[PDB]
């Protein structure tokens, strides 16, 4: 933010050779009305003009009409700088030409019918290179002004030879400098060019201030990114705004060279970079000119990159030249330039983010006729992938949209396409939605389930589910949570599932392994097994690990293993055991020490209010009919497990389903109820049935409980 | 007007005998603008460096007379992958073809297909 600083602003009555500037600024630069002053804005280009000055201007605006803000490359709102331009003289012959599609069919005199009333008395000044829009004749007609004497800033005075014989310009070239490309134009960047900027242009504006910190800047500047990001896109707009003097080289152009001659033209590129210091050497696909030369299958490519590499160790920083490079594979450029000292800084180009994205589609688009209709967001939010050439590509099938849906009024076999229609064409937000449909970017068991032990389950939740209940908690009181859990009883109790639900309500996968698939009969692989489920539980944290008939498991080094692995399994604080056990005497203790299974939990069978709670989850699972009881089923179920419960249900639901699609079927061929099941099918799965665990397994669990009371004193 | 480049080039692949080098013909056949045909093996030549300039000749004969097409049958005859040529010669022939590519845009009424 400074003085000369201006914002641009509309003109009133300001003409091509007058600006306006406010009083309390026209005093601040200590300037005066009249005086001739140097315009600078974007693009590097410049303009002179007569400065006034306008009561009704803001302060921080300037003004200068349209075709001024076309010579100096901007629009409203930009900011341009303002400076007195000292000793402008009195020209002597300035050669104009116009435009060819602007004169196209005047066949007068320009100079009597355009140029001297024009200049007549008026002292303009103008810079060589200034297109300034003269009204008259039949149509008005835009010159340029190719060439002045003296040059570049000289005053049409009244003996000032003014003439206009010559060539017209043409519109593709005042078209192709007017679009062109400059920093606005990249968006999605923002942080990536001003790291650039202020990598390169710094030592080429302010060598001295290296100087005198004492350090040099940096060589090379290496840019890496995905294909379709821009880097070519950022080396041109470098190529543009930058005071020094720009090279660029492509790498396909050097390759294309035969042998030799792309080392003449490397060495031309340095030696013209340090002839007109400050300058800049762009390499464009750096990956293309410089191969591995690790792996190389052509001596030429070898040679190059060697010649590369002297080049730019010669390079002795007094001629300040800074090489920058771009390429899509960073890790194809040769290890030699990548070392320090030689493109020491790489610049990462990432994929735009939406605003970024949504950034560069402002800029795509706003070239293209567009409808009021079409929002922009959208589609920015709908390409998540979509890097800067998609969406070039996909602004193309849009525009492709448009003329399809505008094909059906014209007809390709004419010479010219109607007026109407192309003014009648525009792009919609369907066109774009089309556009994006083609375009392509670049547990479950519950508690429920289980009736019963609902305080086995509460104390399930404080195994898992307090660590991250209450984490702060839990870093001020020191604790580490139990890693392992038996539990010890009949196989009737549903230990398989509580270990489901338990990994379900954290939403944790859960590993479960049966106690003779460890074995292996081989002589370290069942110990390797182990030793891979508990890396599996480890790398799938958060996790739970179950081991079916472990007592199985426990001449044998296998179960050794795991307690090893217990051990180790201790950095990590997110990976649970449970252990399933057929009889309790058998696990060795070391196996039920604390710090490997330091929770003993009893699963008792089934109770007869807890068998009434299956038997609702199977009346859920499965639509049963009120006439049975539940209570009678409990009560003839004290022998059986949940599981042999389940399955009575199951079998009972075969068979009234088999009685309800019995009748059905009969109603139905007699033409050409109840899948609820009934109390009959209840008593036949009973008396199916045949007991689970015999009285003998419930003494030994209850003796292995009796193996396993405090007042403190006063 | 309303702003977008043409494509300038449009690659036509398939499995053989699906009708690539046919729909060639067919524009050949009943284009409006000149027709170039390309044979990609066509281009070599055994004097040095000839074989890029029968490219670059193919493509400034398609510059004078603009509106052109430019037909490039069995690309991959003379466009493999540079990281696995051990050829020279067909090594500077593919940077060629990109640097032509890249300078299609200046061209501004040529258009390259390619089978
Ligand atoms: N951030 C951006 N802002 C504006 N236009 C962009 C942006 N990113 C890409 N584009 C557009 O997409 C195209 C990018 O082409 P360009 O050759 O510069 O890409 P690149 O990623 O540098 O190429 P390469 O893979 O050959 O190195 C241009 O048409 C450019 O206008
Ligand atoms: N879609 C089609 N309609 C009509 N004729 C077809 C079609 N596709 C192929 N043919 C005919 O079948 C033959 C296919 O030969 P052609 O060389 O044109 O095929 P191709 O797939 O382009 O060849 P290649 O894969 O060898 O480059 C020709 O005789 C052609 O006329
Ligand atoms: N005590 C129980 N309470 C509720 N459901 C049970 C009980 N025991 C078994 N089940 C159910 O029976 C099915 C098989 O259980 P099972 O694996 O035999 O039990 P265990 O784990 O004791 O061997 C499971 O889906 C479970 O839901
Ligand atoms: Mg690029
Ligand atoms: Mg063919």
């Given at each position: ?90 020209g002597?012959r300035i050669h104009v030409?116009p ?9 007068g005199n320009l100079f009597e019918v355009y140029l001297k009333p024009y200049f007549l008395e008026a002292y303009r000044?103008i ?5 300034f829009?003269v009204r008259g004749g039949?149509?008005?007609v835009?010159f ?12 049409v005075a009244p003996d000032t030879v003014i003439h206009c014989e ?549």
């Open positions: 933010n400074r003085p000369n600083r201006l914002i641009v602003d509309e003109a009133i009555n300001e003409d091509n050779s007058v600006v306006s500037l406010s009083q309390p600024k026209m005093d601040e630069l200590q300037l005066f009305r009249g005086d001739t002053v140097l315009l600078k804005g974007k693009k590097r280009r410049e303009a002179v003009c007569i400065v006034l000055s306008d009561d009704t201007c803001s302060d921080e605006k300037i003004r200068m009409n349209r075709v001024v803000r076309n010579n100096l490359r901007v629009r409203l709102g930009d900011v341009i700088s303002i400076q007195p331009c000292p000793d402008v003289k009195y002597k030409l435009i060819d599609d602007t004169v196209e069919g005047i066949t000044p810079r060589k290179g200034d297109i829009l039949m149509r008005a835009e340029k002004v190719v060439e002045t004497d003296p040059s570049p800033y000289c005053i010559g060539e017209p310009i043409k519109r593709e070239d005042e078209e192709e400098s007017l679009n062109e490309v400059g920093y606005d134009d990249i968006g999605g960047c923002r942080k990536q060019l001003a790291q650039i900027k202020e990598m390169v242009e710094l030592p080429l504006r302010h060598p001295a201030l290296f100087k005198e910190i004492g350090v040099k800047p940096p060589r090379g500047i290496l840019l890496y990114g995905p294909p379709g990001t821009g880097k070519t896109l950022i080396a041109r707009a470098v190529a543009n705004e930058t005071g020094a003097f720009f090279f660029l080289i492509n790498g396909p152009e050097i390759m294309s060279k035969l042998a030799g001659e792309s080392e003449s033209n490397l060495r031309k590129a340095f030696e013209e970079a340090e002839k007109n210091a400050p300058a800049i050497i762009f390499i464009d696909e750096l990956d293309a000119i410089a191969p591995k030369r690790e792996k190389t299958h052509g001596e030429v490519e070898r040679r190059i990159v060697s010649q590369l590499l002297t080049l730019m160790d010669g390079l002795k920083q007094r001629a300040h030249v800074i090489v920058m490079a771009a390429t899509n594979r960073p890790n194809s450029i040769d290890p030699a330039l990548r070392r320090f000292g030689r493109f020491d800084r790489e610049v990462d180009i990432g994929i735009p983010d939406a605003t970024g994205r949504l950034e560069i589609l402002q800029i795509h688009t706003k070239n293209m006729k567009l409808a009021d209709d079409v929002d922009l967001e959208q589609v920015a939010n709908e390409t998540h992938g979509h890097v800067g050439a998609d969406l070039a590509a996909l602004c193309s099938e849009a525009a492709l949209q448009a003329i399809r849906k505008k094909m059906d009024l014209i007809d390709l076999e004419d010479e010219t396409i109607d007026a109407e229609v192309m003014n009648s064409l525009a792009v919609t937000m369907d066109d774009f939605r089309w556009a994006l449909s083609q375009s392509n970017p670049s547990p479950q068991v519950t508690w429920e389930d289980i009736g019963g032990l609902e305080d086995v389950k509460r104390e399930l939740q404080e195994l898992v589910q307090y660590p991250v209940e209450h984490p702060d908690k839990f870093l001020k009181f020191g604790m580490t949570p139990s890693k392992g859990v038996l539990f010890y009883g009949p196989p009737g109790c549903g230990k398989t599932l509580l270990a489901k639900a338990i990994a379900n309500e954290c939403q944790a996968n859960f590993i479960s392994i049966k106690g003779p698939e460890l074995l292996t009969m081989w002589f370290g692989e069942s110990e390797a097994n182990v030793r891979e489920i508990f890396d599996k539980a480890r790398q799938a944290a958060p996790c739970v690990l179950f081991f079916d008939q472990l007592d199985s498991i426990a001449a044998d080094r296998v179960i050794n293993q795991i307690l090893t692995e217990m051990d180790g399994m201790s950095t990590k604080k997110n990976v649970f055991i449970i252990g399933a056990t057929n009889r309790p005497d058998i696990i060795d203790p070391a196996i039920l020490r604390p710090g490997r299974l330091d929770q003993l939990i009893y699963i008792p069978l089934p109770d007869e209010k807890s068998r009434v709670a299956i038997l609702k989850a199977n009346l859920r699972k499965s639509p049963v009919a009120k006439d049975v009881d539940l209570e009678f089923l409990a009560k003839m179920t004290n022998g059986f497990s949940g599981a042999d419960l389940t399955e009575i249900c199951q079998r009972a639901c075969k068979l009234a389903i088999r009685e309800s699609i019995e009748s059905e079927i009969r109603r139905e061929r007699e033409r050409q109820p109840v899948p609820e099941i009934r109390r009959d099918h209840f008593e036949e799965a009973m008396r199916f049935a045949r007991r689970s665990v015999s009285d003998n397994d419930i003494r030994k669990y209850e003796m292995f409980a009796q193996t396993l009371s405090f007042r403190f004193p006063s």
